[PDB]
């Protein structure tokens, strides 16, 4: 007696480097106007969060989907799936979402993570989360009116966390460059928000940019290799204000078969959602001594 819901992927806005923010109208229609939309990555999962016309959660219409870029000209297709609380697929079963007629609000999360007691998701450091963002018009939450089957056109989603990337190049005298099991440890970042603090995500609440601490850390254990023998390591970090504090970055690398450790102490940092904080480091041999040199672009606003 209901209606089958066929959701159509809207893609995502990938993470970009910082540049001075649009201090304008909430919601912002100008920040993403010239931003390209990428296809949702093949094998990723999305959670469809349904609300009634009064913006109240409808747990019964909560559905998870598996992405397969199997459409016309490599387009994305969404397959009903069953996931764990972290959004990883656990079973085969493809049960379609059937809904009654009416007007509903809907939000998206990727990975298809489980909703907590406060109506949002549990998110720490060392993870990415694409979702509905009320900060921009392009990604803002939409309503659908349901009248056999109906096509649900999904708006594009955007990153809720910051991203840090380290490219480590093999410089003068470096023949072999690998990651140690200890990898890259980022320290002095935001400690993840408590489950006792209220967050009304459906009405526009977003992760705060509060002061990080000496005890919160994240470890990157995996890196990819470029043709030039350089390593690329990346991770998600929660939005954190460390403008008055330091963020230490410890790189544990195996240079020419010997274990080494290098520390980058980074002061004056404002890590925000949807941005990449890219670093390019080079391991060199000066005499017999191994050094790490790095470079990175920095942006600061007028204080006056």
Q: Please give the residue ranges that form the binding site for a second copy (CB under 8 A).
A: 19-24, 30, 244, 246, 255, 258-268, 284, 286-304
Closest CB 135 distance from Cl ion, rounded Å? 8
Closest to 279 (Cα-Cα) out of 147, 166, 181, 155: 166
217: partner contacted, choices Cl ion, a second copy, none (Cβ within 5-8 A by kind): none
299 binds, among Cl ion, a second copy, none (CB under 5 to 8 A by kind): a second copy
The separation between CA 209 and the C-alpha centre of its own chain, rounded to angstroms, equals 15
| Residue 128 interacting entry, from a second copy, Cl ion, none, C-beta within 5 to 8 Å by type | Cl ion
Residue 15 binding result from a second copy, Cl ion, none, given CB thresholds of 5 to 8 Å by partner type: Cl ion
Determine how β-strand 210-211 pairs with β-strand 102-110.
unpaired
- The residue (of 41 and 178) whose beta carbon lies closer to a second copy is 178
Contacts of 163 (CB under 8 A, 6+ apart): 15, 128, 234, 235, 236, 237, 275, 276, 277
> Of all residues in this chain, which one has the CB nearest to Cl ion in the complex?
274
Residues at the interface with Cl ion (CB under 5 A): 15, 128, 274
Smallest separation (angstroms) from a second copy to the CB of 251: 9
Distances (CA, A) of 184 to 158, 173, 208, 248: 26, 22, 25, 10
228, with CB counted inside 10 A (0-12, 13-18, 19+), is exposed
Closer residue to Cl ion, CB minimum distance, 13 or 105: 13
C-beta closer to Cl ion: residue 16 or 180: 16
């Amino acid at each position: 007696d209901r209606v089958r819901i066929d959701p159509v992927a809207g893609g995502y806005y990938p993470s970009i480097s910082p540049s001075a923010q649009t201090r304008g109208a909430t919601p912002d229609g100008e920040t993403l106007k010239d931003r390209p939309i990428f296809l949702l990555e093949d094998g990723s999962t999305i959670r469809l969060v349904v609300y009634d016309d009064a913006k109240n959660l409808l747990e019964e219409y909560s559905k998870a989907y598996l992405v397969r870029n199997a459409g016309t000209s490599g387009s994305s297709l969404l397959y009903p799936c069953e996931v764990d609380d972290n959004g990883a697929v656990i079973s085969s079963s493809s049960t379609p979402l059937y809904m009654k007629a009416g007007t509903y609000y809907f939000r998206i999360l990727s990975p298809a993570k489980a909703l907590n007691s406060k109506g949002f998701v549990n998110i720490g450091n060392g993870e990415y989360l694409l979702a509905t963002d009320d900060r921009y018009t392009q990604t803002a939450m939409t309503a659908v009116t349901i009248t056999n089957v109906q096509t649900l056109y999904l708006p594009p989603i955007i990153n809720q966390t910051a991203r840090m990337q380290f490219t480590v190049r093999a410089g003068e005298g470096v023949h072999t460059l690998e990651m140690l099991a200890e990898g890259i440890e980022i320290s002095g970042i935001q400690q993840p928000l408590d489950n006792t603090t209220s967050f009304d995500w459906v009405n526009g609440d977003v992760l705060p940019v509060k002061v990080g601490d000496q005890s919160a850390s994240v470890r990157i254990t995996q890196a990819t290799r470029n043709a030039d023998n350089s390593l690329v390591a990346h991770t998600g970090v929660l939005p954190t204000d460390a403008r008055s504090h330091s963020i230490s970055v410890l790189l544990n690398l195996k240079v020419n078969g010997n274990p080494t450790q290098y520390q980058m102490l980074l002061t004056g940092l404002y890590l925000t959602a949807g941005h990449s904080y890219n670093y390019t480091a080079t391991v060199k041999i000066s005499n017999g001594v191994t050094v790490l040199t790095w470079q990175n672009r920095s942006w600061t606003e007028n204080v006056v």
